[PDB]
């Protein structure tokens, strides 16, 4: 199953955004396999 | 300026999230531009 993303804000440090772009991104790559 | 990525949650639909995935790529593309 794939990891929740968690959000800290958008105001947060940018390295948790990019944290959040890696988790992020990997959850589309398992949610979103070869879709959209 | 770049623009604050909405997060409606990770329950949300990944349509959604593939919105947030966008906004924040584009954030980053901003910000993190050729850093980190």
New interface residues.
Partial sequence: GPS??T?PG?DAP??D??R??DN??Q??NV??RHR?
């Fill in positions: 929740p993303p959000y958008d940018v390295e955004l990019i959040f772009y992020l991104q959850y589309l949610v979103t959209y």
